[PDB]
């Protein structure tokens, strides 16, 4: 853990130094930002890392859906007759709750590491107990 933390913080400090050699002193206040993010990941033998990255990638799609919904909402409002189903973001919220919302999935790992005698199988046993059928997005492959 210590090694990981020291490496990460080292990297960010190098980012600070890159800012340093590029420093400015003009009145700059309004920026247009380009962000690069890891792409959606689906392939063989995917552990935790993939779950994390996929969650990050899809939250941005949640952001997109809400944004386009806002603009089209006002536009259709000018032509106001009736909207189908507000908040396009629900389509993703249905799984956002499963991944994050307290005692969802990600929370279960937080709780499980704390709990004594962390054993891998008990993790899945708890998940099956807690979010099968109870959660309409948690099922088993074959």
């Amino acid at each position: 853990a210590l090694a990981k933390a020291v490496y990460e913080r080292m990297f960010n400090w190098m980012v600070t130094r890159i800012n340093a050699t590029l420093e400015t002193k003009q009145p700059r206040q309004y920026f247009i930002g380009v962000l690069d993010i890891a792409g959606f990941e689906i392939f063989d033998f995917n552990s935790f890392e993939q779950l994390c990255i996929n969650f990050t990638n899809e939250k941005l799609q949640q952001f997109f859906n809400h944004h386009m919904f806002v603009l089209e909402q006002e536009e259709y409002k000018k032509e106001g007759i009736e909207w189908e189903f507000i908040d396009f973001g629900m389509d993703l919220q249905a799984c956002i709750d499963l991944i994050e919302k307290p005692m969802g999935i990600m929370s279960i790992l937080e709780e499980e590491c704390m709990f004594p005698k962390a054993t891998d199988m008990t993790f899945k046993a708890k998940l099956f107990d807690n979010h099968l059928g109870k959660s309409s997005n948690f099922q088993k492959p074959r």
């Binding site: 307290p102 005692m103 929370s107 279960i108 937080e110 709780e111 704390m114 709990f115 004594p116 005698k117």
Partner: protein, 369 residues
């Protein structure tokens, strides 16, 4: 982030959920002035609490409101609650779920009224008292074994296997921590010193804190320190004197291992814990011997782990491995476990929200724990 605040008679310790160290810990003394006021304009405080009170014991009388895991003279213990919440930890209870601690079975009425007092005036959102030992177990990450916390007010054992709190063998004992101090009073009268008052009676536990190591083969070590002057130790009071303690040094803690000195006719802790071992199945003894965990306070005395190992291995059949778990995280393991338990998300559903109490009446704590 709810809260966790220990109840134990000795040191009311306060902290926050999840944090690995109690934010503030202080002795549970409550003090009142025992002389008239002489220098007009002092603006005297009518009562004192905690280390502030311990600061000026000189003109103070000390009431411990918590004896033998029973909360007596509730007025001052409420005063301690109030001082804790606002001055030490410094948040209004109105925005923090709270968890307390309680010895195995103390009385029935205790919880059933304490929940009320801390839940009606402090107006806390939610609370759940958890029996000491199961919490101590969590604190060490071992979900199977016997707990011997012996928190200063009371000493007790539970068998817990595979995470089941097997009730009927719970073997409580009132060989409290304070009573070692009180007996040390009587044993220290003999060397010619005298400690009549209450303030000195508080000092002596401090002098107990350093100079009490339990020793194997009590007879041989006793005759040893009697014949030779090797361990004649010294110490000083905040008075100027220096005091020389002889074999009382290792005659203090052995009241634990046999109570014939204090008088109480209930076997020493090692025999009680062996008893509670032998009052379970013939298959749980395989593991129970292996995960023996000390806890609470009053076991920071050096050696006590080893002496305990000797006594048990003598008592138990010499085919089991009795390697006892005594981490030096003791005296706080209660609180560490409490914080971890408060950190468990699944645990969130358990404790009692105000609605249930209001609509159900006080007994809800017993009915639902």
């Amino acid at each position: 982030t709810a809260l966790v605040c220990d109840n134990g008679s000795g040191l009311v310790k306060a902290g926050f959920a999840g944090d690995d160290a109690p934010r503030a810990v202080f002795p549970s003394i409550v003090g009142r002035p025992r002389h008239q006021g002489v220098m007009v304009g002092m603006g005297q405080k009518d009562s004192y609490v905690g280390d502030e009170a311990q600061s000026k014991r000189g003109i103070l009388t000390l009431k411990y409101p918590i004896e033998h895991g029973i909360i007596t003279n509730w007025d001052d213990m409420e005063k301690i609650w109030h001082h804790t919440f606002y001055n030490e930890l410094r948040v209004a209870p109105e925005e923090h779920p709270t968890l307390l601690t309680e010895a195995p079975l103390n009385p029935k009425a205790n919880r059933e009224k304490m929940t009320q007092i801390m839940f009606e005036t402090f107006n806390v959102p939610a609370m759940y008292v958890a029996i000491q030992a199961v919490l101590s177990l969590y604190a060490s990450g071992r979900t199977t074994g016997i707990v011997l916390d012996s928190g200063d007010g009371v000493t007790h054992n539970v068998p817990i296997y595979e995470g089941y709190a097997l009730p009927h063998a719970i073997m409580r004992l009132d060989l409290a921590g304070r009573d070692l101090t009180d007996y040390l009073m009587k044993i220290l009268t003999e060397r010619g010193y005298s400690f009549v008052t209450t303030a000195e009676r508080e000092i002596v536990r401090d002098i107990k804190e350093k100079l009490c190591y339990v020793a194997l083969d009590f007879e041989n070590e006793m005759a040893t320190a009697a014949s030779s002057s090797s361990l004649e130790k010294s110490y000083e009071l905040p008075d100027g004197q220096v005091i020389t303690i002889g074999n009382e040094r290792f005659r203090c803690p052995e009241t634990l291992f046999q109570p014939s000195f204090i008088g109480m006719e209930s076997a020493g802790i090692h025999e009680t814990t062996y008893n509670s071992i032998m009052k379970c199945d013939i298959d749980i003894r395989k593991d129970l011997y292996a995960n023996n965990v000390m806890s609470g306070g009053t076991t920071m005395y050096p050696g006590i782990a080893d002496r305990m190992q000797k006594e048990i291995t003598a008592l138990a059949p010499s085919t089991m491995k009795i390697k006892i778990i005594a981490p030096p995280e003791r005296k706080y393991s209660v609180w560490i476990g409490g914080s971890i338990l408060a950190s468990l998300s699944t645990f969130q559903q358990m404790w009692i929200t105000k609605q249930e109490y209001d609509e159900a009446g006080p007994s809800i704590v017993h009915r639902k724990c």
